[PDB]
Amino acid sequence: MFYALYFEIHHLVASAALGFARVAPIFFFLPFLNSGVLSGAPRNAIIILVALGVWPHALNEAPPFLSVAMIPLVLQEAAVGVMLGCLLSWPFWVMHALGCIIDNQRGATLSSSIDPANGIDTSEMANFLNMFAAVVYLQNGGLVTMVDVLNKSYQLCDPMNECTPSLPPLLTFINQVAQNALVLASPVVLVLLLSEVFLGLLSRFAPQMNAFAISLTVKSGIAVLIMLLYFSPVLPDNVLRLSFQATGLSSWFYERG
Amino acid sequence: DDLVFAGNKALYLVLILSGWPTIVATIIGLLVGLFQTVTQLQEQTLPFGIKLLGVCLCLFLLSGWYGEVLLSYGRQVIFLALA
Amino acid sequence: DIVSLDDRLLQAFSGSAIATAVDKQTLVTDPKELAISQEMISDYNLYVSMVSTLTRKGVGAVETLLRS
Amino acid sequence: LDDRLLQAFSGSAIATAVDKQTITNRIEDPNLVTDPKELAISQEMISDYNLYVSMVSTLTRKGVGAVETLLRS
Amino acid sequence: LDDRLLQAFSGSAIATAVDKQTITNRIEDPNLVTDPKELAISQEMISDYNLYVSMVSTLTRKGVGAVETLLRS
Amino acid sequence: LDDRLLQAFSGSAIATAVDKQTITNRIEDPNLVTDPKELAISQEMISDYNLYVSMVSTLTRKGVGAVETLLRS
Amino acid sequence: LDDRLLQAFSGSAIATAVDKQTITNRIEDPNLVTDPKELAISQEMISDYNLYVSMVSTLTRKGVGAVETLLR
Amino acid sequence: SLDDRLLQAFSGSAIATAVDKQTITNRIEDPNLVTDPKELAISQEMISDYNLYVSMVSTLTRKGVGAVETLLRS
Amino acid sequence: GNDISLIALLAFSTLLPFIIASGTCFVKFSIVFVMVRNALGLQQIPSNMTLNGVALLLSMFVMWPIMHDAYVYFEDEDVTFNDISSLSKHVDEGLDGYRDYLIKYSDRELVQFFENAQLKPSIFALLPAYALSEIKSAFKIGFYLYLPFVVVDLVVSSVLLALGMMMMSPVTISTPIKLVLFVALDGWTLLSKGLILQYM
Amino acid sequence: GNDISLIALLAFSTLLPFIIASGTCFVKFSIVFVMVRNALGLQQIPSNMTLNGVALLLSMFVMWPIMHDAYVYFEDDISSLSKHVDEGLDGYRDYLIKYSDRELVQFFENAQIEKPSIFALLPAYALSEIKSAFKIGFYLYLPFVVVDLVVSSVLLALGMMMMSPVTISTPIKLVLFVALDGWTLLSKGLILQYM
Amino acid sequence: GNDISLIALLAFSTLLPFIIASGTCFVKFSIVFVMVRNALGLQQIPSNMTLNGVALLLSMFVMWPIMHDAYVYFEFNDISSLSKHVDEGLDGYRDYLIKYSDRELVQFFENAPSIFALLPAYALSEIKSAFKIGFYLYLPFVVVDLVVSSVLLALGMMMMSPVTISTPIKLVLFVALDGWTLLSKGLILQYMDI
Amino acid sequence: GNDISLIALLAFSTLLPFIIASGTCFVKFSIVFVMVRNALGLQQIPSNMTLNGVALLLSMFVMWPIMHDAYVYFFNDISSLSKHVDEGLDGYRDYLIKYSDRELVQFFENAQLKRQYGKPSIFALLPAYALSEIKSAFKIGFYLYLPFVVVDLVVSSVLLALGMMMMSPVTISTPIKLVLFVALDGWTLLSKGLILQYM
Amino acid sequence: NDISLIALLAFSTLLPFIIASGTCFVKFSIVFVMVRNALGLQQIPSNMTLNGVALLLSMFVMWPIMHDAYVYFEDEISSLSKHVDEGLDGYRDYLIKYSDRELVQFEIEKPSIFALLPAYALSEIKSAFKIGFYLYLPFVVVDLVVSSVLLALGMMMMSPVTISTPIKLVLFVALDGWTLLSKGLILQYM
């Protein structure tokens, strides 16, 4: 069969297409893969190398979706990629928002947010802690886990079984991210309120002593001293507690939806 | 490891360099507040005028040392990244 | 009537037919079968060329709605 | 496995070289050039070499042209 | 508007279906393939079909082109 | 690097210039133009030159094309 | 100016249509397509038409592209 | 200098090409030149050399403006 | 296949991000979230990428069944046509799947006015007649969620004046209380359920 | 068709997004919606894709009668063609004259009964529509500036001089505008100017 | 018609959008309109699609007389005569650049008049003038921002931000002056010499 | 050489620039320079046409020994030819394996065996390399960012000391970043350090 | 010569990337953008203008090198190599004036051009940041002065950029920064 090899190349590029639909939404969400870091001639090749690595079937034979209407199929795959994108970023999104709380409680967000920004345009603590949490996750070899959930997703779920997110857990997602960040930051907020109350009552005893500025000068020290004392114990949370794992695919997703 | 160590020092340096200017700014604030309660005057430009001199002055005297701290840390981290 | 106008007016590629062709495959045969191969050679080169684009459009449309 | 490309290419290359030389040797014999029977058999031999090499050339040009526009963006 | 756009789509979707078939039936029927007058006329129909579809493609791309820069700015 | 490239360039430039002239001189000598024995070589010499320059100007374009594609975009 | 644009366009369109027709009439007349000297005149007319319309298309489109560029 | 190199190059080359085709047209309109191998042999050389000259100058001018688009549009 | 049936595929996927921005419920969900964030004081918490993400996913549940139904309708091979007008009406019969959804939420008096201005129902009148109602519905639904946070600010500010503690700034104190009160009560779940239930 | 007729049609269909952004009412429609958002003080809601989406639709209802009436005319010596072409624009030229400032037209006509010229009308129209949008926006701010000052009087009457009001007037600004059915009034009214 | 004359005619049509960006007054008009937007404190409206459009149309009136004088002219058979003939055409434009550029810059560029020396000297001359106009446009509004702030401190409103109420005042003032009618006129009068 | 050697050489030259982008150090160098630009905040300048310029030049010194060794390197049976050609590529496999993280190669090998049945080849070896250089490139980016964070947080704190809560630090901290970079050896430190990892 | 023609065509095609690194255009294009940023302008002037003017100036200083190579017979075995290299000298002599020996290694000497190009590029970029740093100082003081005056008046919630922008413009057109910068840069090479 002379033409046989000619067709076995077109089946690769057609399967390779549907990999891009689910992996590219992931490369957008992670802080080390987004176009701000990786762009240009490598971006479009590297993504396609990953798509072919995790693909679950024999790569030389005909693609099973050939008979299905593409547009309803494409818009389904992109949502599954966007869903996984949120789950993998969770450890970073927690550490980032943790920063934004500290910058407000310490320093400034403009009282009326007419500017609206204050601090740096992504206030510098929330950009610093975001970067820091990412570098440690790679060093623990987490990168191998990110690729692992992709291959499994293709085995528990595949496009011709119309995989679909579970609605019941998706409705709770936003509280989990908020709750995780709120608890971790708590040790640094409470002392700030207590210190403002300490000065507040003093302006009963020395009334024209200015309440505001003497607290505003001070807070930017108390926030840093107390963070340094807890900088070490924050690392263990990123590695084990918040990292997503392939075991979760059993409950977040269900097929034939 | 070489990451948590390098990360700790970044927060440590902030407290060190900004410490003296924030401290001196704090003390000067309280003094004007105490002097006001001693009398019936009430003015808000007074604390700013007194603090402005102190904040600029301490930085000026310290400017020579800041470069020593930063130029050593910059070389230290570059070696870890490429060693 | 001029021609049998029917639902064949409402699709771009006849995927059910093309699938029928690619199961026919497990030297040349000339010129009769060499002519028929011209269809199956081209129809598959064009189908792939569309699929490569609809995904780029569809991903990019998701990214447009998230940027804002 | 994509190492199949090495097997297909290696087989075709050798098979081609043999036919190029055979056509040449069929012209160096004093009677493979001068007997109608042996001339007519060289015409069937020389047609096929032309069509085969051109088919591979044009099919491979398309196949690469598919991978080009997949990756480029 | 829409009731007018539906009319434009359907009118063209049918004219191309009929025109494309007319070319095919002129090329399989022998008395129409081998006569210079009928060859001369088929040369016209082929080119006119090619131009018509090329023009619709261009003008449609421009329609969904002007919408891009105005909406997305 | 570069000094090694200058050598590869210089060699090819001269080797071509000698071949161009070597062919021309076979058309002026009357014992070569009018003898089939000497003509049969000229047809090969004139063919081998064509293929060499045609190949060298194709690959070197594709090399250049691979630099633009990394840098331009 | 719009007053001049209508003039520049109008002259262009009419002058071109007249030329297209002239060639067609030279092909149907049997005394011309059969005469070698009349063919030589026709060959020039065919070429001249091609090069004129091509120049208008190019220069017009580069004039539009200069406007597009400055607005984005 | 630099401002005048374009006038010298443009003007100097225009006169050299204009006269060359003119000396070709009239070479194909002389009973002695169109019907003699010694005259046809030279005309085969002449007509090709003109063809290459315009092709090179045209190409390089386009690359000149192409670099100016590249460095300015990007 | 049919070339004009091909051009429509490429045009549609080029317009898709602008259609979702008006002719889809994505408009209402995303808006309500940004206003609730805005009222909580802290800004970019959750990050914008959270909000526009969930709103995009939750909306697909409502629209994706409609899209799927539109294509499956055209796939029936048993239909036949005999005239240009017969085709136009057959195509229109497909869009009724989507039209019926827009007709539910769009207000009658807007559509009727545009259907008259259109001269000298139609979807081009139902797109702008729908977009304006989904916007408006969000400013109502949100206004009721500002009431409790206003109460919290007034209470603490009054408490501060009972302690006789002048020119403290009543924002450091109240910002964290709003989050704890809202986050400890899983507000984001109750909010998300209340949205889907209107359309599901 | 005709060879030189294609070139004219293709160039025009390229420049559509600029002509609509400068010479058509889309200029007026697009601004007014953004001023309403800022009068309320909203930063991101609704998205620019939403508002620009509407201005581009409402404008089509107004302009379509012009393009349809124009197409039928073109479907239906040098001196004859130019005069024939101009009558097709008269349907459009009239529209610009109705709104464009009467004196600017003369001022630009002198820089280039006389029937006005489109090249004089375009800049006179663009600048005249902008002014009308800024004018409308001004009226839309006054009802909220009263709200903002009134709230401050309450906080000061309770002495809460560092209870910055903006949290309290933001929801009032919304109740007022939806109780005014603003989005409906603006959409009905803004179109009636062109009927 | 000649091939080399045509090549030079095609190439100039490639470089048009650059010469009009540096060598023509379009730079003053584009800058001035964006500064107006910034003075009002508006951030997306009107679009750069509109401002870059209107500024382009107005600038067309000023340049058209210069291009037509080259249009009505051929823009003869010897290098010296051909140079003089071609050079004499550009001279209609040389008289423009030299009227709006500073002698001291050209002189420095003449030593590394020539056209290449005139182009960069002209660009810097138009740009600095634009900032000289913009400065004057801020003065009538900045006084408004200070006046609003000044009165609120009399009321004791320590921290009612101004912008919620000062922004409309800026609009009425600009509209009451008919600003666009004054600016668009004065800009052309600098060049049309009417 | 044969007729089929042209199309194999020609076909390779068509796909050449995609390999250089995905299986060569040029991917590492590209990210490092963009990471610096972000730390300074100068996302307009320098142009990518500049940074991508220096990066391809430096990569030349590293890869050249592998290409020269190959063309100088370049039969009775298919087994003789096929196994001879493969022996040429082995000169390149050694490079990828030396720089790819061991854990990833082992993962992509496993993933390939499961589909087929239920030393690494180029197909499975190539993606492991790209991910590995990116990971390491991101680590380098961090240490270069780390010294400038101090300047931002310190300048921001000092402004609040005076109560200038309305001032925007970026306008002030930008020159401080440049001063530090100029006082260090800057790009000369990185370019040397990067090459020494492969030389 | 045919092979000499390929080396001429491939040169013209790679020409725009060389200017982007191996020529002084690199230094000139950055400095002007930093000026705009220091003034606080973000939309105007468009990059189309600055990248235009910056390129013109960079040719005046480069023209003497092009002409010498053009009038020299650069090209149409060992004698041929020495003939070509003797032409490239006109550019090697230029780069070595700016490339630092400590990096070119990665006074009579003959270093390869492939080593000077990357060494040269980084050297000009480092020099660009130096000029940018200095130009920020005269305006940064302006922003701080206005802020301090407002706080004397207690207007702690007015954003000073509403009023600092015109002052920055006035001071720049008082020095004619464009003349000093464009004048001085030429003198650094001539």
Curated annotation (Swiss-Prot), chain A:
Residues annotated as transmembrane: 12-32, 46-66, 82-102, 127-147, 182-202, 211-231
UniProt keyword terms in alphabetical order: Cell membrane, Membrane, Transmembrane, Transmembrane helix, Virulence
Superkingdom assignment: Bacteria
Protein family: Belongs to the FliR/MopE/SpaR family.
Organism: Salmonella typhimurium (strain LT2 / SGSC1412 / ATCC 700720)
Predominant cellular place of this UniProt entry's protein: membrane
One Pfam family here: Bac_export_1
Ranges in coiled-coil conformation: none
One CC-aspect GO term: plasma membrane
Biological processes per GO annotation: protein targeting
Chain's role: Involved in a secretory pathway responsible for the surface presentation of determinants needed for the entry of Salmonella species into mammalian cells.
Protein name: Surface presentation of antigens protein SpaR
Swiss-Prot record, chain B:
Any Pfam family: Bac_export_3
InterPro entries, A to Z: Bac_export_3, T3SS_HrpO
Keyword ATP-binding: no
Keyword field: Cell membrane, Membrane, Transmembrane, Transmembrane helix, Virulence
Location of the protein in the cell: Cell membrane
GO CC terms: plasma membrane
Protein task: Involved in a secretory pathway responsible for the surface presentation of determinants needed for the entry of Salmonella species into mammalian cells.
NCBIfam families: fliQ_rel_III (TIGR01403), PRK15333.1 (NF011861)
Family according to the record: Belongs to the FliQ/MopD/SpaQ family.
PANTHER family attached to this UniProt entry: FLAGELLAR BIOSYNTHETIC PROTEIN FLIQ (PTHR34040), SURFACE PRESENTATION OF ANTIGENS PROTEIN SPAQ (PTHR34040:SF7)
Protein name (Swiss-Prot/TrEMBL): Surface presentation of antigens protein SpaQ
Species whose genome carries this gene: Salmonella typhimurium (strain LT2 / SGSC1412 / ATCC 700720)
From Swiss-Prot, chain G:
Annotated keywords: Protein transport, Transport, Virulence
Source superkingdom: Bacteria
KW Membrane (keyword) present: no
GO biological process: protein transport
Disulfide bonds: none
Coiled-coil residues: none
UniProt record similarity statement: To S.flexneri MxiI.
Function in brief: Required for invasion of epithelial cells.
UniProt protein name: Protein PrgJ
Source organism (scientific name): Salmonella typhimurium (strain LT2 / SGSC1412 / ATCC 700720)
Name of the gene: prgJ
First-to-last residue of the parent protein present: 29 to 100 of 101
From Swiss-Prot, chain K:
Main location: membrane
Membrane topology value: Multi-pass membrane protein
Membrane spanning stretches: 7-27, 54-74, 133-153, 157-177
Gene Ontology biological-process annotations: bacterial-type flagellum assembly; bacterial-type flagellum-dependent swarming motility; protein secretion
InterPro entries noted in UniProt: T3SS_IM_P, T3SS_YscR-like
PROSITE patterns on file: FLIP_1, FLIP_2
Identification of the protein by name: Surface presentation of antigens protein SpaP
Organism name: Salmonella typhimurium (strain LT2 / SGSC1412 / ATCC 700720)
Gene: spaP
